[PDB]
């Protein structure tokens, strides 16, 4: 049947993307937390 993951490069970038993260107080904490932890990528991969 239709499953839950329906990839959409625009959807991915606009929802989890770097610029969406930077606009919001909670989003910046995410980047800060993912930097602090040392994540190789702060934001989902998507080719655009």
CB–CB of 9/48 below 8 Å? yes
Q: Is 47 in the site for RNA (CB under 7 A)?
A: yes
Nearer to RNA, 7 or 38 (CB): 7
Q: Is 9 in the site for RNA (CB under 7 A)?
A: yes
User: Tokens 């490069």 belong to which residue?
Assistant: 9
CB of residue 34 to Mg ion, shortest distance in Å? 6
Residue 25 CA to residue 47 CA, distance in Å, equals 26
Residue 1 CA to residue 15 CA, distance in Å, equals 25
Q: Is 19 in the site for Mg ion (CB under 5 A)?
A: yes
Q: Is 46 in the site for RNA (CB under 7 A)?
A: yes
């Amino acid at each position: 049947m239709k499953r839950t993951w329906q990839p959409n490069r625009r959807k991915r970038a606009k929802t989890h993307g770097f610029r969406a993260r930077m606009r919001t107080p909670g989003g910046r904490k995410v980047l800060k937390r993912r930097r602090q932890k040392g994540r190789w990528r702060l934001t989902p991969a998507v080719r655009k």
